[PDB]
């Protein structure tokens, strides 16, 4: 009991600091200024002049023109002070792609009794019940009655709107003039007709002010029985590999972290081979192995994620006129997992209390004595601090230019505490009783009044120590 | 930001116009000894 409690305790502490450093490094969270604003600019906008037909509450099933020629039209032609400018914070990228899942004839069998009324509506997702003929008016493939299974896309398996591997879809040009013309053609005709169950679209962004990539997916699940459900899944992904003098420190911390994980994995195998095995009913050997297993992950994920992201970002120019550039959806499928896995063990790892009792929090909440003592000091320190302020304001009021207004003497004295004295005109304004002020203020503020605070802290620590020792030795 | 792939082709007086033979402004391939100035935007080398 003289080595371990002094060995893996220290090792775990250093492990804690090491992980918290690159937790800070990872903790960018620029989304609140780069994904919240991006989402508001793309999901908080009025389709009409002023109404409730926004992205929050979809307009209507027959509002194809009212919806596509709206905030969506403000994504291909974002005109501000065909264009990419909404709030001077984001730009365009890739090529737009909208999927119109039309549930055409095949919803239910049509008997000879009452098929003449209705037999083809927007039913649940299926294969032989989806779009099989023109979903309304379409001369050719405007309402394309083809299954896009070979489109290199995986179904989202949506709960509110079931997602399949097939469905009518089309892309837009490098601008919105052609996109608007196609939308108008499909509105005069019928492609997103009443049989359409849900509409899906995916998009990317550049946002050159804060260099990153944005992946956004928009889904409007207009139920056949009425209404429409909005869904917006938007998330960023950046690549900052090596340009700075701080990210190299993060890389070094990651290397140190990998060495620590190697140390803990080369240490755990011996506890099962040499030490008696199949003994995990301790709840402590349980965390030791699961933490290591999770830590092995996100190491072979981060490298793979970085490599894949770099490879994908390399080909970011050939998509100006390319047909489809919405293949990055596979990337986020990993990026969020590493965003989740990293927080599925950083708590778990910090959830280790073998070194000190968990239920002994009675000495971390009875420290209110320290808080009470710290309050009977602020009312014994501000009395002396305000008397000096008054004296300075009365003696040096008219001359110094710093002890001019009472609200300024306070800040001047605080700056004096921070070692920002001037003393060029404090003494000039009054040869005697002026330096006396400064000397006594320094002697009573740094020697006799500062140290009572440290004494209070010292006594709080000693009392906590003594109480804990008495409790644990009773 | 907006970095890319460093050019490596040959050019002429003014810029790119290889007409007859070797360009007047050759690439002068980097040596493997002496590089890595470590500027601000990226880590550079002795090629150019």
From Swiss-Prot, chain A:
Motif extent (Selectivity filter): 418-420
Binding locations of Ca(2+) 1: 418
Localization in the cell: Cell projection, Cilium membrane; Endoplasmic reticulum membrane; Cell membrane; Basolateral cell membrane
Residue spans, topological domain Cytoplasmic: 267-282, 351-374
Effect upon mutating residue 108 to S: Does not affect localization to the cilium. Loss of ion channel function
Regions crossing the membrane: 5-26, 246-266, 283-303, 330-350, 375-396, 432-452
Ranges within the bilayer without spanning: 409-423
Residue positions binding cholesterol: 334
Annotated glycan sites: 82, 105, 139, 152
Effect of residue 465 to A: Abolishes increased channel activity due to a gain of function mutation
Top-level taxon in the UniProt lineage: Eukaryota
Effect of residue 458 to A: Constitutive active channel. Reduces but do not abolish ion channel function. Reduces but do not abolish ion channel function
Outcome of mutating residue 454 to N: Gain of function mutation
Disulphide bridges: 108-121
Residue intervals annotated with topology Extracellular: 27-245, 304-329, 397-408, 424-431
Protein modification: Phosphorylated. Phosphorylation is important for protein function; a mutant that lacks the N-terminal phosphorylation sites cannot complement a zebrafish pkd2-deficient mutant. PKD-mediated phosphorylation at the C-terminus regulates its function in the release of Ca(2+) stores from the endoplasmic reticulum.
Expression (tissue specificity): Detected in fetal and adult kidney. Detected at the thick ascending limb of the loop of Henle, at distal tubules, including the distal convoluted tubule and cortical collecting tubules, with weak staining of the collecting duct. Detected on placenta syncytiotrophoblasts (at protein level). Strongly expressed in ovary, fetal and adult kidney, testis, and small intestine. Not detected in peripheral leukocytes.
Role noted for this protein: Forms a nonselective cation channel. Can function as a homotetrameric ion channel or can form heteromer with PKD1. Displays distinct function depending on its subcellular localization and regulation by its binding partners. In primary cilium functions as a cation channel, with a preference for monovalent cations over divalent cations that allows K(+), Na(+) and Ca(2+) influx, with low selectivity for Ca(2+). Involved in fluid-flow mechanosensation by the primary cilium in renal epithelium. In the endoplasmic reticulum, likely functions as a K(+) channel to facilitate Ca(2+) release.
Quaternary context: Homotetramer. Component of the heterotetrameric polycystin channel complex with PKD1; the tetramer contains one PKD1 chain and three PKD2 chains. Isoform 1 interacts with PKD1 while isoform 3 does not. Interacts with PKD1L1; probably forms a Ca(2+) channel. Interacts with CD2AP. Interacts with HAX1. Interacts with NEK8. Part of a complex containing AKAP5, ADCY5, ADCY6 and PDE4C. Interacts (via C-terminus) with TRPV4 (via C-terminus).
Similarity comment text for this entry: Belongs to the polycystin family.
Entry protein name: Polycystin-2
Organism (species): Homo sapiens
Part of the full-length chain shown: 216 to 697 of 968
UniProtKB/Swiss-Prot annotation, chain B:
Source superkingdom: Eukaryota
PTM summary: N-glycosylated. Cleavage at the GPS region occurs through a cis-autoproteolytic mechanism involving an ester-intermediate via N-O acyl rearrangement. This process takes place in the early secretory pathway, depends on initial N-glycosylation, and requires the REJ domain. There is evidence that cleavage at GPS region is incomplete. Uncleaved and cleaved products may have different functions in vivo.
Glycosylation sites: 20
Record localization: Cell membrane; Cell projection, Cilium; Endoplasmic reticulum; Golgi apparatus
Family, per entry: Belongs to the polycystin family.
Annotated function: Component of a heteromeric calcium-permeable ion channel formed by PKD1 and PKD2 that is activated by interaction between PKD1 and a Wnt family member, such as WNT3A and WNT9B. Both PKD1 and PKD2 are required for channel activity. Involved in renal tubulogenesis. Involved in fluid-flow mechanosensation by the primary cilium in renal epithelium. Acts as a regulator of cilium length, together with PKD2. The dynamic control of cilium length is essential in the regulation of mechanotransductive signaling.
Associated disorder: Polycystic kidney disease 1 with or without polycystic liver disease: An autosomal dominant disorder characterized by renal cysts, liver cysts and intracranial aneurysm. Clinical variability is due to differences in the rate of loss of glomerular filtration, the age of reaching end-stage renal disease and the occurrence of hypertension, symptomatic extrarenal cysts, and subarachnoid hemorrhage from intracranial 'berry' aneurysm.
Domain statement: The LDL-receptor class A domain is atypical; the potential calcium-binding site is missing.
Subunit-structure text: Component of the heterotetrameric polycystin channel complex with PKD2; the tetramer contains one PKD1 chain and three PKD2 chains. Interacts with PKD2; the interaction is required for ciliary localization. Interacts with PKD2L1. Interacts with PRKX; involved in differentiation and controlled morphogenesis of the kidney. Interacts (via extracellular domain) with WNT3A, WNT4, WNT5A and WNT9B. Interacts with DVL1 and DVL2. Interacts with NPHP1 (via SH3 domain). Interacts with BBS1, BBS4, BBS5 and TTC8. Interacts with RGS7.
Annotated protein name in UniProt: Polycystin-1
Lineage of origin: Eukaryota, Metazoa, Chordata, Craniata, Vertebrata
Full protein segment contained here: 3771 to 3818 of 4303
């Amino acid at each position: 009991y003289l080595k371990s409690v002094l060995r893996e305790l220290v090792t775990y502490l250093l492990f804690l600091i090491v992980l918290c450093i690159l937790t800070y490094g990872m903790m960018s969270s620029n989304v609140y200024y780069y994904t919240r604003m991006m989402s508001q600019l793309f999901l908080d906008t009025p389709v009409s002049k002023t109404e409730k037909t926004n992205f929050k509450t979809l307009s209507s099933m027959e509002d194809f023109w009212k919806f596509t020629e709206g905030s969506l039209l403000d994504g291909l032609y974002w005109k501000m002070q065909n264009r990419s400018f909404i709030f001077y914070e984001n730009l365009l990228l890739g090529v737009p792609r909208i999927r119109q899942l039309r549930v055409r004839n095949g919803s239910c069998s049509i008997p000879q009794d009452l098929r003449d009324e209705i037999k083809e509506c927007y039913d649940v997702y299926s294969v032989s019940s989806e779009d099989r003929a023109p979903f309304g008016p379409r001369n050719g493939t405007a309402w394309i009655y083809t299954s896009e299974k070979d489109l290199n896309g995986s179904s989202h398996w949506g709960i509110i709107a079931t997602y399949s591997g097939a469905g009518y879809y089309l892309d837009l040009s490098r601008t919105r003039e052609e996109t608007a013309a196609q939308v108008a053609s499909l509105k005069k005709n019928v492609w997103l007709d009443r049989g359409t169950r849900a509409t899906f679209i995916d998009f990317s962004v550049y946002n050159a002010n804060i260099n990153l990539f944005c992946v956004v997916r928009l889904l409007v699940e207009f139920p056949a029985t009425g209404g429409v459900i909005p869904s917006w899944q938007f998330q960023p992904l950046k690549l900052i590999r090596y340009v700075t003098t701080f990210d190299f420190f993060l890389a070094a911390c990651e290397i140190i972290f990998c060495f620590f994980i190697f140390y803990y994995v080369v240490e755990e195998i011996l506890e099962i081979r040499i030490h008696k095995l199949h003994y995990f009913r301790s709840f402590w050997n349980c965390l030791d192995v699961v933490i290591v297993v999770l830590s092995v992950v996100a190491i072979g994920i981060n490298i793979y994620r970085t490599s894949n992201v770099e490879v994908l970002l390399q080909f970011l120019e050939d998509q100006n006129t390319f047909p489809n550039f919405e293949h990055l959806a596979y990337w986020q499928i990993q990026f969020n997992n590493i965003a989740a896995v990293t927080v599925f063990f950083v708590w778990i790892k910090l959830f280790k209390f073998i070194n000190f009792n968990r239920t002994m929090s009675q000495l971390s909440t009875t420290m209110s004595r320290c808080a009470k003592d710290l309050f009977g000091f602020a009312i014994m320190f501000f009395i002396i601090f305000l008397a000096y302020a008054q004296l300075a304001y009365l003696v040096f009021g008219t001359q110094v230019d710093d002890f001019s207004t009472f609200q300024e003497c306070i800040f001047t004295q605080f700056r004096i505490i921070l070692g920002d004295i001037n003393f060029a005109e404090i003494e000039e304004a009054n040869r005697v009783l002026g330096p006396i002020y400064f000397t006594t203020f320094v002697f009573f503020m740094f020697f006799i009044l500062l140290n009572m605070f440290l004494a209070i802290i010292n006594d709080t620590y000693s009392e906590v120590k003594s109480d804990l020792a008495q409790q644990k030795a009773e | 930001s907006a970095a890319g792939g460093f050019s490596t082709s040959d050019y002429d007086v003014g810029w790119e116009s290889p007409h007859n033979g070797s360009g007047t402004w050759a690439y002068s391939a980097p040596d493997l000894l002496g590089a890595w100035s470590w500027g601000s935007c990226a880590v550079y080398d002795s090629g150019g």
